[PDB]
Amino acid sequence: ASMEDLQAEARAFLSEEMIAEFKAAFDMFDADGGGDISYKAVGTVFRMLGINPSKEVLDYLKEKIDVDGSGTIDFEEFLVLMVYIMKQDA
Numbered sequence: 001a002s003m004e005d006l007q008a009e010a011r012a013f014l015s016e017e018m019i020a021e022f023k024a025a026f027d028m029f030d031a032d033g034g035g036d037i038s039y040k041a042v043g044t045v046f047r048m049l050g051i052n053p054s055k056e057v058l059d060y061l062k063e064k065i066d067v068d069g070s071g072t073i074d075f076e077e078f079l080v081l082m083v084y085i086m087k088q089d090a
């Protein structure tokens with residue numbers, strides 16, 4: 001449900017301007033070459049936006065993101081994990 005339900009609210013928190021830099025860092029790790037990167041790549045991207053790759057997220061991405069079994073994260077799967085931590089990021 002990480003992508004499906006969560007992307008809906010994600011766009012409410014993250015602005016399109018924010019998405020601009022999100023996709024900038026995301027695009028460099030494009031695995032399928034279209035809108036799709038591996039969730040592990042986040043390690044570098046998370047550093048660019050200043051997000052903390054915590055224990056919860058690593059455990060969360062498998063069951064909530066890749067319940068879909070893509071082995072990767074589409075931009076829709078990606079936006080969620082960023083805003084997920086960022087929303088509570090103090």
Ligand SMILES: [Ca+2]
Nearest residue numbers: 065066070072
């Ligand atoms: Ca997936």
